Design a protein around this ligand. Structure first.
Ligand SMILES: *[C@@H]1O[C@H](CO)[C@@H](O[C@@H]2O[C@H](CO)[C@@H](O)[C@H](O)[C@H]2NC(C)=O)[C@H](O)[C@H]1NC(C)=O
Lengths: 195, 196, 147, 443, 98, 49, 49, 49
């Protein structure tokens, strides 16, 4: 109606740190594109804002399901989530975007957005799930905690002394232990001892 | 900025087809009159905002402010935000919703602006107004972290010149010249004319 | 210093408190398992009878066995006493001038008289703001006791 | 002028001779008296004034407030006294900001302006020299802090003389000051002298010793001036006419009569209320505390009655003064049963419950402030003969705008007054227990 | 309720994707066993619950409301109507009909 | 499916969150967390999930 | 952007001056139109077995 | 469990856990927990309870 191309040929431009319109991204057709998936941090890190954190997904703490792609959006009471599409061999980290997260941990994180007033970035672990220690180097979220990729690791993770020498947690929110689920039955003994 | 409207005015009387391939003529203009005018620069500001919203969808929620400060569509921009919000497909919301600038103390708008506490500032004012707004924001504290700026062609248009006081890092975005040659636009249009 | 000060409180079955014998020692007792019941002499406070604030008494139970293990494991010596005024510990806001979380057993620690609290001491936000809690020995919830 | 009293404190330090003052600058609030110094000031201790400010705020139930202060004396303690007074109470009132600033070089305005601009609180306590108050108020007028809905509260010092008032002060400014009757040489001196003679009376009783001492500063201070030290307690304990001049450790009178005063329209200082003993008489001299429009924040006096669970009257803790937490105050004049007229002191029983909670929730959305009391005559509205009774009467008499409670709905009352949509399902019903069960052999 | 309740957004959509034009089809789906559960208000539903009864209602009624006539604003009769239906309750008419 | 006997796991532990060994957002974080324990919501989350 | 329509919009529209039906009474609708006192108090339950 | 004339109400509320206590600058804090963890994992804690 503006006589303008129906499919706008558009590019996204960011006012850079030093008077420069660094190409933030470009818009093609219906889809919106941003060249860098990660949000850039202004100047020096301030208030541990948007600290990277990956929370392990399990029935007990967090749960992941696909975003409503029909709308292209994540469920209102859930959190839009990301991960790195696995490309270990590949130079690229990979992108595993658009998955929503659920659960009481997720809800706690919401509580924490307000409580500690800190922005956060959340992704999923690739190598090893809950940390696994083999030979010289440890594996899992703990690795990303050691490598500096992750500041804090969240999930159903259990506590151990070794994790304690390396890192720490001061919460102990729920009671959990090793257990077994059996289908079993009980029976009468001596017919109530014949009364 | 004014130039487009002027040529558009000529178009309303003449009825001669006109278009433009670069710069200001390409820069957006107020709603086209009932009589057809020249029109290559114009884009649905609403659409433009939906582009911006896509950016907001990726990283922006509960935008700090949308203000009908200056030029075309102060009233018009206001509706769309509502239209965007009206679908209610997701969980959208607004915190700041005012207008104004130059005529009186900037302060009536400023004191109202102080009240809003949100993540992304939305701007619909000319670069000239914006210049002053930049000055306002530093005093205001909008320039500080947690107050991202969404800037359209209204300001973005002067690619060559950026007011130093323009509290950078806020998104400023419009069409880019290198991507498409300015000369390139003219032949195609001529072709379109031929096909018309 | 290797020698250590421990404050505890009477609270069965974590801490039992009994009078020493005539000769001032703790009666030798045996558990169901058959291992000798380990006991330690713990300074006691006021008795049921009038006065008698100063006394030597016998302490044993879950928390006492834990103390013995910790002391042996980290190799430190200690002396145990029962907390003054018989309380776990809560801050009191306004009795005369504004007051600290010096109530009962917890304050004693603040004074530096007690270097460690070894008892069924609940880990909570209020207390964690002022002292350091170790990993909790047990997980428990409040309930109601009736006739 | 405030400074004269301070000079005199220095003099007390210099000559060790008692000095006191009955009016004006000597009367103004001053820095907590150095213990060695001996002096008398005709004003209420800083702490006391702060207390009155708190009582005033409590009376209007302004829970949320900030303090703007200056480096002027007693500022740090003021915070301390407030910290104790505010802290002790169960209530969740909020201190928003405390600001300490002075004009230094050419940026005090910048720094002050940047510092003051952040604030958003409705109720402001200010503390400074009178002149400084002028500058701070000009600055506030620029900032827009003086305007409607924000309100300012002041200790004694800023008000100074009743006659003089730069209109730089905003109207509606609320401040405390000494009773006018007190502010006459006639009695402040009469009183002061009486105090002197009672101190002297105790010279007769305590030690049978003459208080008289050499007065010269230039001459070496008398060794026996030392003894006056003990003499101070008698000095402190001074009474006459069955009236207390009793001082406090700061050197202000221990029990000094005081009046709550406001700036009436234009240049008038009208005492909004008066303070007697422990109790605060928060008098609503200015019924409309709102500038420009009467209609805004319209009054809605409300009457109710107690019924369980919905509207429950509870007796507030005597020791824990005033309603605690959720309970909202409701007052009915304490009508003497014996008195036919039964004119009454409004009751102090706190109403709470589902009905009160609903009103509280609705009120926030409505954003209209309201007064709640209890009905006396007729209980639930009743038509007896030709005349109605109960809360409906106070709705008809316009003594109540809206009546809230467990009140049921009927055609007559809907006819006389518009009713809200019912929020609950109720009606006539029966309460009884069933006797037995029937057996049919049908298995 | 699902709309306004962002708390129920999940459910809002979960629900939406299975919605029906009418009660006859909505009741039928459960009866046909096409859909395991059906959500609706009591006045229309309970009568049906009596009507067939294989199907059951469960839990506690939530979001209570009282039925009223809808009319264009300023209707000078609504008030009278309100009085009339009030009388219908008062005289047990409303009650008798139910 | 059922738990063992009463359901005592026989291994006793609770969930924990990582922090850089150097990092202590947790000591500060701890305070917020407890009241959260005290607060009714944990049980709401319990009832929620 | 549109009127509620259906039975109600016809009402706003004036197709039907008055609406006689078993309709629940709610605030979102309430601003637009006047409503009489409510005849029944029915609550949502889930009808299935 | 020891006095059969006394019983508990069924509901469990305000779930909470007990712990050892030391001043924040105690040099035995790191050691005290590691020991507690070891005793839980080892089974020492189960033996005592
Ligand atoms: C101020 O002085 C009066 C008069 O002495 C005190 O009132 C007396 O207090 C004593 C206490 O020992 C009582 O025995 C007397 O019965 C009181 N009245 C008399 C003496 O008839 C009063 O206590 C003093 N105020 C202070 C600061 O305590």
């Amino acid at each position: 109606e503006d006589g303008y191309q129906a499919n706008p040929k558009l590019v996204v431009l960011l006012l850079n740190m030093e008077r420069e319109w660094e190409k933030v991204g470009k818009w093609e057709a219906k889809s919106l594109n941003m060249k860098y998936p990660v949000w850039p941090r202004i100047d020096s890190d301030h208030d541990d804002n948007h600290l990277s954190i990956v929370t392990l997904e399990e029935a007990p703490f967090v749960i992941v399901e696909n975003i409503d792609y029909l709308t292209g959006t994540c469920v209102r009471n859930t959190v839009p989530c990301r991960k790195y599409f696995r490309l270990a061999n590949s130079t690229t980290e990979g992108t595993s975007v658009k998955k929503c997260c659920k659960g009481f941990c997720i809800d706690i994180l919401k509580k924490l957005s307000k409580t500690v007033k800190f922005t956060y970035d959340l992704y999923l672990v690739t190598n090893g799930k809950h940390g696994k220690k083999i030979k010289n180097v440890w594996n899992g979220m703990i690795g990303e905690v050691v490598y500096k990729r992750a500041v804090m690791a969240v999930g159903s993770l259990t506590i151990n002394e070794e994790r304690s020498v390396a890192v720490d947690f001061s919460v102990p929110f729920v009671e959990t232990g090793i257990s077994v689920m059996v289908s079993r039955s009980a029976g009468t003994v001596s017919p109530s001892a014949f009364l | 900025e004014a130039i487009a409207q002027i040529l558009d005015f000529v178009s309303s009387q003449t009825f001669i087809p006109i278009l433009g391939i670069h710069g200001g003529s390409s820069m957006i203009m107020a709603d086209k009159d009932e009589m057809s005018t020249f029109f290559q620069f114009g884009a649905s500001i609403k659409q433009q905002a939906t582009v911006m919203l896509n950016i907001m969808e990726e990283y922006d929620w509960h935008v700090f402010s949308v203000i009908t400060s200056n030029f075309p569509g102060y009233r018009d921009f206001i509706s769309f935000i509502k239209t965007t919000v009206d679908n209610s497909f997701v969980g959208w919301e607004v915190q700041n919703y005012i207008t104004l600038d130059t005529s009186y103390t900037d302060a009536q708008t400023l004191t109202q602006l102080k009240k809003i506490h949100s993540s992304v500032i939305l701007l619909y004012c000319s670069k000239d107004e914006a210049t002053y707004i930049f000055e306002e924001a530093r005093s205001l504290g909008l320039m500080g972290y947690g107050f991202v700026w969404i800037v359209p062609s209204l300001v973005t248009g002067n690619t060559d010149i950026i007011p130093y006081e323009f509290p950078s890092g806020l998104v400023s975005v419009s069409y880019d010249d290198w991507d498409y040659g300015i000369e390139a636009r003219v032949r195609d249009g001529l072709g379109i004319i031929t096909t018309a | 210093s290797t020698r250590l000060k421990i404050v505890t409180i009477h609270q069965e079955p974590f801490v039992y408190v009994r009078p020493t014998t005539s000769d001032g020692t703790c009666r030798e007792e045996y558990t169901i398992n058959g291992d000798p019941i380990k006991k330690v002499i713990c300074n006691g406070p006021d008795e049921t009878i009038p006065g008698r604030p100063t006394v030597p008494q016998c302490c044993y139970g879950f928390c006492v066995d834990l103390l013995i293990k910790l002391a042996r494991e980290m190799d430190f010596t200690y002396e145990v006493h029962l907390v003054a005024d018989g309380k776990f510990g809560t801050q009191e806001r306004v009795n005369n001038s504004n007051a600290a979380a010096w109530n009962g057993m917890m304050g004693e620690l603040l004074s530096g008289q007690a270097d460690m609290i070894v008892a069924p001491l609940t880990i909570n936000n209020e207390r964690a703001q002022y002292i350091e809690f170790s990993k909790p020995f047990k997980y428990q919830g409040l309930t109601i006791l009736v006739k | 002028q405030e400074a004269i009293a301070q000079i005199l404190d220095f003099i007390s330090v210099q000559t060790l001779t008692p000095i006191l003052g009955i009016h004006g600058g000597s009367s103004m609030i001053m820095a907590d008296k150095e213990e060695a110094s001996m002096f008398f000031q005709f004003g209420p201790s800083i702490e006391q004034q702060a207390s009155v400010m708190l009582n005033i705020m409590e009376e209007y139930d302004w829970y949320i407030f900030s303090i703007v202060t200056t480096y002027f004396p007693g500022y740090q303690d003021f915070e301390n006294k407030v910290r104790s007074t505010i802290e002790n109470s169960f209530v969740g009132w909020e201190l928003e900001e405390v600001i300490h600033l002075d004009m230094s070089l050419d940026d005090i305005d910048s720094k002050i302006q940047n510092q003051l601009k952040k604030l958003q609180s409705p109720v402001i306590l200010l503390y400074c020299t009178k002149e400084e108050a002028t500058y701070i108020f000009e600055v506030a007028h620029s900032v827009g802090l003086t305007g409607y809905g924000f309100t300012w509260i002041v200790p004694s010092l800023v008000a100074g003389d009743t006659d003089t008032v730069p209109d730089e002060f905003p109207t509606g400014l609320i401040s405390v000051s000494y009773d006018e009757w007190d502010y006459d040489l006639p009695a402040r001196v009469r009183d002061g002298i009486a105090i002197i003679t009672t101190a002297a009376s105790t010279m007769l009783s305590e030690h049978n010793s003459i208080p008289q001492s050499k007065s010269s500063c230039n001459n070496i201070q008398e060794s026996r001036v030392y003894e006056a030290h003990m003499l101070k307690r008698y000095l402190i304990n001074v009474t006459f006419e069955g009236r207390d001049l009793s001082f406090s450790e700061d050197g202000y009178q221990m029990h000094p009569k005081l009046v709550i005063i406001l700036l009436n329209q234009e240049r008038k200082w009208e005492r909004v209320g008066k303070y007697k003993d422990r109790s605060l008489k928060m008098w609503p001299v200015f019924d409309l505390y709102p500038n420009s429009e009467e209609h805004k924040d319209e009054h809605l006096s409300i009457v109710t009655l107690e019924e369980a669970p919905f509207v429950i009257v509870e007796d507030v803790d005597p020791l824990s003064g005033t309603c605690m937490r959720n309970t909202v105050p409701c007052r009915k004049q304490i009508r003497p049963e014996n008195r036919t007229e039964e004119g009454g002191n409004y009751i102090k029983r706190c109403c709470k419950g589902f009905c009160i909670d609903i009103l509280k929730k609705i009120a926030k959305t409505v954003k209209f402030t309201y007064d709640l009391y209890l009905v006396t005559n007729g209980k639930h509205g009743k038509k007896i003969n030709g005349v109605w009774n109960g809360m409906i009467g106070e709705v008809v008499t316009k003594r109540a705008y809206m009546a809230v409670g467990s009140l049921t709905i009927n055609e007559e009352r809907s006819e006389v007054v518009d009713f809200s949509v019912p929020f609950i399902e109720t009606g006539i019903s029966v309460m009884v227990s069933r006797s037995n069960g029937t057996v049919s052999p049908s298995a | 309720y699902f709309r306004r309740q962002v708390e129920l957004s999940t459910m809002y959509r979960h629900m939406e994707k299975h919605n029906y034009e009418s009660a006859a089809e909505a009741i039928q789906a459960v009866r046909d066993n096409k859909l395991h559960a059906f959500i609706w208000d009591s006045a229309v539903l309970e009568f049906e619950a009596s009507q067939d009864c294989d199907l059951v209602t469960t839990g506690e009624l939530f979001f209570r409301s009282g039925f009223g006539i809808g009319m264009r604003k300023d209707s000078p009769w609504k008030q009278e109507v309100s009085l009339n239906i009030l009388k219908s309750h008062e005289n047990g008419f409303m009650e008798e009909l139910d | 499916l059922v738990t063992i006997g009463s359901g005592y796991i026989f291994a006793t532990t609770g969930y924990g969150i990582a922090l850089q060994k150097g990092s202590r957002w947790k000591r500060p974080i701890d305070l917020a967390l407890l009241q959260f324990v005290g607060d009714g919501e944990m049980e709401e989350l319990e009832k929620l999930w």
